[PDB]
Swiss-Prot record:
This is Rubredoxin. Belongs to the rubredoxin family. Rubredoxin is a small nonheme, iron protein lacking acid-labile sulfide. Its single Fe, chelated to 4 Cys, functions as an electron acceptor and may also stabilize the conformation of the molecule. Residues 2-52 form the Rubredoxin-like domain. Fe cation binds at residues 6, 9, 39, 42.
C-alpha cells in the first residue's frame, strides 16, 4: 500500500502499518484516516502529509 510523509517532521504514515496506538488498524488508507487524525510524532494535521509517489 502507499506511504505518506509528514512534511513537518518526517514521520512516515505507512498504510500497511496503520497507527494502532492511535486507533488505526494496519491497512487503513490515508484517505480513510479520520479528518482529525494527526501525525503521532508532531501533531500535524492531515493537510501536512504528502503521498510518496510521482
Ligand atoms: Fe509529523
Amino acid at each position: 500500500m502507499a506511504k505518506w510523509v509528514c512534511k513537518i517532521c518526517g514521520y512516515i504514515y505507512d498504510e500497511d502499518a496503520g497507527d494502532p496506538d492511535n486507533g488505526i488498524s494496519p491497512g487503513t488508507k490515508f484517505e480513510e484516516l479520520p479528518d482529525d487524525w494527526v501525525c503521532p510524532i508532531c501533531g500535524a494535521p492531515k493537510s501536512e502529509f504528502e503521498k510518496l509517489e510521482d
